[PDB]
Symmetry: D2
Subunit: 262 residues, 4 copies
């Protein structure tokens, strides 16, 4: 069924994770037609500034995620940054996430594939839709069987990303496609020491993604985005999550009739 | 508000081609009564890549052909102008005067269109940012236009390729009604060397995106046999697929509409 | 010999034209190895804002240019915007300039070609280097024999232009190539009601143009750029013109040894 | 100040290939005494497009091969790391630790390199704006690096193409020494499907541009027979053309130098 990956960008505290996890569990009970997957990063390994928030470590993060998985029975997904992290993260993560900048790092991909878990790769901002065919092949080579490719924007001049929706049908030829509604509107390093983004475009582009056709949506949410330690400009208020999910399910129900074959 | 659907053959290859397409557009206007149809066709392709490509049969012949369509089917008309002098005559038959993409910054052309009292639809230049359209609309208001449209037809993305940045729809809606050109948006500028190329397979998906995001109309060129078109042969929709595409976007629009943001 | 097209962006007054023309005449006498061509627009037909400066008309402009041509004996070049202007402008203009946004408008090209004058086309920001082959062909078709193609930047995201120097050798296959050092660094509609630009990059990129190899340089200059009515952000101070010309001639003398064939 | 020339075969195909190229680089270092030569070659291509493409013979073998080059020719050495653990061992032989383009934002990799006391050269990511390199340099200074380099290797321009925005050279010079990668800049990412393509014919002209603008060094991969390279076969310079290219850029640099701006 339709996939909805959601949660706070970073594991700011396992307390925050339980709050968001609670709301996601509720939506999970309300939308049985949807498969929810809780997402959160145990470490922001690519911040622009050395002085920005990274996280509390892999140990504290895997622990907090497991708490969410046991307390709410929600599947989990977090991203790895170096080959060694794959195995420990697989203990809890149902889906292992490969960062966009790292989408061509063979060993990271193979490490993830080896865990036997499902793998979701963020399409690099420097990658062409058709170039993702090779990414999928690496994973298959490594034994991955459940592979996802996530659209999250493409380099368009400086400090800007554009979403070429032509990629959704193109990538669908070799993998399930997920649309990242949060990072697609951010402005890389836009604020100097941080990245920007325009929240006002999140919903409009998400509606476009389902109208075009995708297997799932990725959307980061936080009780108080403004206070978020990371991706503050683009995180969605927890309270708006329900309305957007219902909205995309309705659009999908009608649009699906026209989704092209293969 | 009534949804606008601008459709027709890219170029006025002949008065007969126009009546052929017009007949189908008239049939559809009868079924889709919640839609305002506008018949489009250029009397001249003044910007072909090659000197050897088809241009047209002239302004005189073209306007005559468009008038025939309006009289026989009672359909509104739109066509593009290329130099200021053409505004006046074209305004005699055109309900909406279209301003080519490459020309969206030419002050005199915009002014010439504006003073005719007709509606004006500006194709957003491939070099223009969405927020730069505010001044385009200002120029038109200054020249007297009361009904203004801004059309999204793609932006330069590397060489011989265009990308559609859907953030442009809500941005431009701040100062004008917004039209999405479903056919030129999948065009590959100069892609075939002496001609431009295109990917027909992406027309429908992107048009669904456009209506899900929210726009006031769609512009899509159609032709009985796209393969034989004298222009835009790679992006023109087969006339028989027109009805289905329209039904589909009216359906996606309806279900999405309640979520369109207020500007 | 090496071509140097220079002058004030717009004909703000024939007074301004005579001042700049005087300095250019002096450089002309000092650099006999160079062919100077005085440039100025009788009308800015594509301003972003309706409230910006356009000019004093085609009559007043052609008159002022002729004054420069007679008083200093300098060849002339100005740009046309609609087909009818070609003939009258040819009376004075040795080289007719085709605006970048208008580089694919067949009739404008043919009108210019018909005058028997030389034609210089600004490569559209939306055009690929190889796409200029067709532009040249239109002109030849129209009877033009002295054809130039000017590099002036390419659309790179929003409100930004990038100079792909690969274009210089590519366009050279079918026409003489001129590098526009002034418009290449401007930021389209950058100031909202006007375009921006960074003067600090003009000289560096001009040095690159001659190191790569081009048949000429196009450079706008003004006694007091800050007061210029158009392109204020990118116009070069008249006083710096001599030093830059000498600089490019020296770089060209050494570099020319390595300019690739054809 | 001494001009830096980083050259060598893209990948350590064998210790013999290295000695072959090293021998010529040593001969050239003897002639061009005003130049500081640094021998480059990767012990691993950790980011190939295809799983079936050549990667290398391992870190152990590679470092052993690079050491042989340093001992036999007395040349400085540089090679890239892909994960933090590799910094320490690689630092035993590498004078300059290179950080791959796609990895220019990975904090731990940068930190690992910085704490070795070796010089660090960061390839500017194809997704990074020139002004965004300031934080990259800050991270390195924070981790202990005292000798830092930023390499220009092109920016994403549409699909499967890169463009070099020479404005990056003076911009980046504000916080670090600047190197121009003459070979990867003409590369066509994923251009050949399972491999990347490239246009060798543009290497020389763009390198002339780089030195005319002003930079502190050039990075150019060379190989006895580019056509047979196991990687970057499309952008690697034939070893015999190396000498001429270097002479030419030293000449253009000299004549242009008096015009280089002060930052
Ligand atoms: O530019 P800054 O603010 O460090 O932001 C980096 C974020 O955008 C980052 O961690 C994001 O989730 C990266 O992919
Ligand atoms: O590049 P060619 O095929 O001449 O095409 C130009 C057309 O696509 C053109 O007339 C289009 O309708 C231009 O705006
Ligand atoms: O954006 P504004 O300030 O109107 O500027 C337009 C100038 O850049 C313009 O006339 C220039 O010489 C156009 O090509
Ligand atoms: O796309 P392929 O040919 O695998 O190439 C990747 C190379 O060009 C690569 O290793 C280059 O040296 C990457 O940064």
């Amino acid at each position: 069924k339709f996939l909805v990956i959601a949660g706070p960008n970073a594991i700011e505290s396992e307390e925050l994770l339980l709050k968001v996890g609670e709301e996601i569990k509720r939506l999970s009970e309300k939308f049985k037609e949807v498969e929810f997957v809780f997402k959160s990063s145990f470490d922001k390994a690519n911040r622009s500034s050395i002085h920005s928030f990274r996280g509390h470590g892999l140990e504290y993060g895997v622990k907090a995620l497991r708490k969410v998985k046991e307390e709410f029975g929600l599947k989990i997904t977090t991203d790895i940054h170096e080959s060694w992290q794959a195995e420990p993260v697989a203990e809890v993560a149902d889906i292992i996430q490969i960062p966009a900048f790292l989408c061509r790092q063979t060993d990271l991909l193979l490490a993830a594939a080896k865990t036997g878990r499902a793998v979701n790769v963020k399409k690099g901002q420097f990658l062409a839709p058709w170039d993702t065919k090779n990414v999928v092949e690496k994973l298959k080579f490594g034994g991955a069987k459940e592979i996802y490719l996530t659209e999250r924007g493409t380099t368009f001049g400086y400090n800007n990303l554009v979403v070429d929706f032509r990629s959704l049908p193109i990538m669908k030829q070799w993998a399930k496609v997920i649309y990242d509604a949060t990072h697609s509107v951010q402005l890389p390093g836009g604020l100097g020491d941080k990245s920007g983004g325009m929240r006002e475009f999140i919903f409009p582009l998400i509606r476009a993604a389902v109208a075009v056709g995708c297997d799932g949506v990725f959307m980061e949410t936080h009780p108080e985005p403004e206070k978020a330690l990371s991706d503050a400009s683009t995180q969605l208020p927890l309270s708006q999550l329900e309305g957007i999910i219902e909205a995309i399910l309705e659009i999908r129900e009608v649009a699906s009739k026209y989704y092209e074959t293969i």
